[PDB]
Amino acid sequence: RQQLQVLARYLKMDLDNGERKFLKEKDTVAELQAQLDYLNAELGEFFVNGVATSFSRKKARTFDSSWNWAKQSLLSLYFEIIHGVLKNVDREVVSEAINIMNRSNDALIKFMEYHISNTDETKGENYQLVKTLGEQLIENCKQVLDVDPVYKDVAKPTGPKTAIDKNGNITYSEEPREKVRKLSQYVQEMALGGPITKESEDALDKDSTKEVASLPNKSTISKTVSSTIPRETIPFLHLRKKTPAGDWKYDRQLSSLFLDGLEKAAFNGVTFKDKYVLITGAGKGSIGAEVLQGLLQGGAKVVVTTSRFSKQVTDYYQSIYAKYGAKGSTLIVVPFNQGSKQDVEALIEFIYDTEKNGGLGWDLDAIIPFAAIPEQGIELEHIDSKSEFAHRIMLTNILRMMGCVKKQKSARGIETRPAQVILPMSPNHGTFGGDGMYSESKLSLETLFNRWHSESWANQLTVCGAIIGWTRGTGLMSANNIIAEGIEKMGVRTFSQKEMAFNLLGLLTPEVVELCQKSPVMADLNGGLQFVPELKEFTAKLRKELVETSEVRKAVSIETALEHKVVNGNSADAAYAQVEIQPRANIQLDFPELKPYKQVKQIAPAELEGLLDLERVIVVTGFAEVGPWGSARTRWEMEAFGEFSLEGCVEMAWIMGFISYHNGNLKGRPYTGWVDSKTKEPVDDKDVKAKYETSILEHSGIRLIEPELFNGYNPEKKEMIQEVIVEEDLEPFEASKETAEQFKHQHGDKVDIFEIPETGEYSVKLLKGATLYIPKALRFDRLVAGQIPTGWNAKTYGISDDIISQVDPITLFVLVSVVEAFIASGITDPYEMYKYVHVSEVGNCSGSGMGGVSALRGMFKDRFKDEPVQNDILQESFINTMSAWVNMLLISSSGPIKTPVGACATSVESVDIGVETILSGKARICIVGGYDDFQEEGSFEFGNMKATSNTLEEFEHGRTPAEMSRPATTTRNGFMEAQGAGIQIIMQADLALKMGVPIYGIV
């Protein structure tokens, strides 16, 4: 230590310099951590975590392909009628008609004309129905070709209905109102108010086709609903006027304008063409969601925010756009946290920024800031982090959002296009209690009515205060649904989200828009609720009367059952009790259905009989695959239905090794069925879904690369080696004589080797100037692939360990696909073919683009690193070796063997070769298809060619693995690599008929 110190001093090395720097930084950390701790103690965790940014421009999802969705919607309606899913009494028919008319263009009309004109009305009643409806919808679409699209809701208005059953269960159901069966009658009901608000023809539900014929006809309103408003009755929906005293009072004239607009909207629909709207708080079940749907139906351009940006949410909005997005409409979905001041500013900058700068280049006409979080059970003394954060969302950041829009408009000199702010005001100013700072947020918004006059933003923003009534079903109010029938018995109105949305969409009509440009608008959409005195106590009494009745009925029914049980014993209830059957998975092969000859004879022309040489007609008799979604059966369920049946789940659980079959004694008792492969616990088929489906879906399909499936390949840590010239001799190391001489042969003078006489080993001493390789790791940006389901194992199918150890993994995919294709052909012993054909007449024309790439790795990389590699690795690499193994293990033919290599088109080249092989007379049966594997090296090179999608770019765009493969989309940016095999069995039709194999198709 003393010698080291003396040398440290000679060298002017401060040995403690690093420990000294460390202790300075440890003090800096504690100072910063104290500042953070202090802010957490002041704001609380909820708030500090709550203000995290969500918004990014790259996550914005644009929906505008209404031109395509219109045709999809037509075809869906067409087939739903043909299949009897939609009848001539369903309102869905009329609603779909409206959405199709809203997208009317010349292409859509030609599409409809082709589909409807080529409909054979004699095939059945449903065909006559679709033909008649379709002809009417064509006439409608021609009339509205040059007409602005309309928001027009034809859904049945729903009232609240609470039921308590005999056993005291409470069922809340939305039930069709008796008096109010259309929105036009809803408006009439709103106009008339009730006794409590007193101060001192159509084919709907009977002939949808007739209702559709009426849709283009702008109904003339002789006498307006406003004329029917009784003297000294306040409508359930009304506008207020500020008195010279500064009080807001019912105004009959303004209210008449609003209600007449609602009536026109209800008969004729309203357009929002060329309105640009920002809406916050429009998630599923919200008011905002229904507002969004109407705006898109009227052709608006809408930015919708979400605090829960996910695939499920983007798919929700996509389905909304595809159903309701009219011509000229656009939906932009953005992640957004309204609790973040940075998100607010960034969002508005994004909206106003030029397309060149990566913005939308929009100017807003309306802002609908409905973002809210629920505060429940938070009285005054509990007001803390959450309530402060909620108040930031619901007040402060609304003012900031308005401010941002004002600044953007003013910076661009826009003084003649004000944005209407629809403020979600409340009649709840501390009346219910327990809602944190809710009431303070809502009441504070009322300052905007005065600030519009007193400040300098009136030309940029208009104020429309919507006092929103009791709206059932929302994030804020779903907890209050059970009592709503009771509230309505007072002659008061609660609203569905649809009705409330319709009320609020009334504020965006041209007449209300002009009114808010003159002065702030106050709209009471409160359904007379304000006239119910002592509302909170009234609602708490209705709740108790209901909960008490529920709990009493539960208790009295339980005791009456126990009394009956005691007096009558077990024999009284044993014969009353009844046995439940749980389904077992019965996996089917899905052979094609064969029709009676008479039916099948009607499809082909009569002349076809005896016309074809059936030796020259090629059929597919069987097919299979091994891919990211299992077999052909499981992949089809996922492709066609998006979910597994019981059969699909059990198949996937078996494929993935989750379940195994067991026949014999299991913990004493004899058991026949599925067990958990790990624990060996019995599993009922009905429980496979709950037990395994989440695992199945996580470890199937396109997903993050699993290193355990690819010999520890980790794209995040790709192993390379770097050549380095040794600057100084290495510490000697021991090696065998053989190895030492191989080092000497390589390095010559840059190495010294010396026998160690005792042991017979050699010292190896690499000298200055010698070449070494030092491993280094690269982060690669392709992280995702379509991988065969985790747990797939060729042994599950029966392939022996000797085969598994010999062949490249690709070969196992093929061997499985081939046996499965033969099973799909009903050929369980391939040698049965030789009852019908010569051994020379069974061919294999399947191929691969790249072959046994794991064997290539073996010979190019593993051999170079002197790793153990089987001596015959080269043979397992060849593209034709998979077909050789098939022949060697299963088929034993002496037929043609033509192995194509066609990169991504190999499987079609295979079929072309197989077809021609059969038509040439060289084969009667041909194994066709293709196969390829995924491995590190090919993934890297497809990345260097920029053919594959860059996962890191996808993650910047907020894409999850399941949405990275999006063919024909605006934002598609490269393919997603997968692995596996597909095989068909093709044969001459004459032979397929003689063998009696299933025929899936004619090639």
Partner: protein, 145 residues
């Protein structure tokens, strides 16, 4: 995706496909990804399953169809599964690296049966029915053992 749409669209136009009768596009790789050489084989399997079911799977990742594709009036890009009353023929197209273009057409198997007599058909139906029962037997035995 552009070249393939344009190619199908030009084939349809040249052969006088009716205006208003677009081919319905299926894009299986949204779900599977691209397995290179197996690509066509998975598509062919799909095609066969479409023909025998009448069910046309939708491209559930088709969030927004590229506006450049609106010019291809003979193609329709569905986002959701359509249950049709029958598909008669499916086109499978493939484009490999190295100018490997391919196309296969698969026709519904029921068009074969119009070529034969009732007795031949009924003999076949019986044979296939027996083979199918034997295949189910084989399959379940194989799966569980």
């Amino acid at each position: 995706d552009k070249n393939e749409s344009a190619t199908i669209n030009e084939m349809m136009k040249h052969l006088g496909r009716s205006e208003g009768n677009p081919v319905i596009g299926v894009f299986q790789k949204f779900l599977t990804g691209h397995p290179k050489g197996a690509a066509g084989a998975w598509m062919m399997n799909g095609a066969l399953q479409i023909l025998n079911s009448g069910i046309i799977p939708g491209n559930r990742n088709a969030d927004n169809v590229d506006k450049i594709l609106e010019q291809f009036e003979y193609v329709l890009y569905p986002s959701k599964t359509l249950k049709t009353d029958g598909v008669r023929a499916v086109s499978i197209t493939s484009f490999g690296f190295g100018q490997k273009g391919g196309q296969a057409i698969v026709v519904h198997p029921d068009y074969l049966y119009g070529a034969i007599t009732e007795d031949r058909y009924n003999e076949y139906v019986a044979k296939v029915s027996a083979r199918e029962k034997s295949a189910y037997k084989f399959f379940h035995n194989g799966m569980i053992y």
